[PDB]
């Protein structure tokens, strides 16, 4: 009997742009890029959901305004799973740590940048800040794309594998192959 462990799932992380960017005029300026990022992230989330459906049939602090709109969507349904969880948490923690950076601005908050600095320079400053946070989210989206491709390949492999006795596991499955 040989035991093998296959990842099936990854934590669904959706982003709402309305409080991630923010007035409601910054949303009009910066909504397109964040809309592509949000659409890619919900594509990743729906991909993970049908991965679980096909195979089977900051996360501690979150369990939304405190995290700048960076939420975790709960799904409707031992080494490799530990890497999946650890690098997912590393990606999310790196993202949260990177929103805390000022990104070269006079401050990392939107209240102070409209307070002690003039509007015709504040427009450039706020552009730098919000577009930098959006590029950080772009880097997170790219990492989730490549990792979602990896767990996608593993999920189709597990679906083709589904004598053998299966058991559920956190974000994955385990197979007992009797031979």
């Amino acid at each position, epitope marked *: 009997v040989t035991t093998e462990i296959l990842p099936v799932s990854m934590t669904k992380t959706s982003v709402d742009c309305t409080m991630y960017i923010c007035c409601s005029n910054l949303l009009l*300026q*910066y909504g*397109s*890029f964040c809309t*592509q990022l949000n659409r890619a992230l919900t594509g990743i989330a729906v991909e993970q959901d049908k991965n679980t459906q096909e195979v089977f049939a900051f996360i501690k602090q979150y369990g939304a305004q405190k995290f700048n709109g960076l939420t975790v969507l709960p799904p409707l349904l031992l080494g490799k799973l530990q890497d999946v969880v650890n690098q997912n948490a590393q990606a999310l923690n790196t993202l949260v740590k*990177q929103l805390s*950076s*000022n*990104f*070269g*601005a*006079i401050s990392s908050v939107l209240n102070d940048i409209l307070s002690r600095l003039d509007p015709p*320079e504040a*427009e*450039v*400053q706020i*552009d*730098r800040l919000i*577009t*930098g946070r*959006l*590029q*950080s989210l*772009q*880097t997170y989206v790219t990492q989730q794309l490549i990792r979602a491709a990896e767990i996608r390949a593993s999920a189709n492999l597990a679906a083709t594998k589904m004598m053998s006795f299966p058991q559920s596991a956190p974000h994955g499955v385990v197979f007992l192959h009797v031979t």
Partner: antibody
Amino acid sequence: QVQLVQSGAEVKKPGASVKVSCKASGYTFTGYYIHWVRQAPGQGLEWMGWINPNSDVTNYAQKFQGRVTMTRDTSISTAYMELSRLRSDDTAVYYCAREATMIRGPSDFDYWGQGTLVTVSS
Amino acid sequence: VLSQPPSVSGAPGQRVTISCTGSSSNIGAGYDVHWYQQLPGTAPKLLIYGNNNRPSGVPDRFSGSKSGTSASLAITGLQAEDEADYYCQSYDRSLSVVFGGGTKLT
């Protein structure tokens, strides 16, 4: 791969304006940045200005304030430069560069464009 | 804005350093200094990003560092291909990028 390609050369006379176009391919034109930097022949690079494709807010240098208007067209992924009121000192190669992914403050110009020679003389 | 030496020379095969001196508002403020190589007749190519990091397609002989209001590039083992224009840059408090002068390593 990512490539930035420019239009042809211009032999615009003094008093006119340029329409130097920068087509960006291989990457999402929404996001990142499009900077314009000119180089006079025989001298070093001096900056002109950056446009952000998301918001169309500019940042010119203090020398080029009021004469240069960067416009972006995200449908064709192309950044137009309009340097109005040319003089004889504006004969230069007008490079189009792309700022890289910003981590902990602003970063380098990861890819550079082709060379547009704008010569201005009688 | 950034002050650099006009040109530098040297025989092939040894280490030579070029500098990049600026004010406290653009290097001393903590902004990343970047270095660029321009071969004659072509667009300048990325040489050093992130002040010490090295991108792909470029060998390890190029190196860079900062200290306070200064930055420095060094080449180890120079050859007949490395004679090209070099530039340094930094961002300021208005986040307006400033290029240094052209250094003619010849």
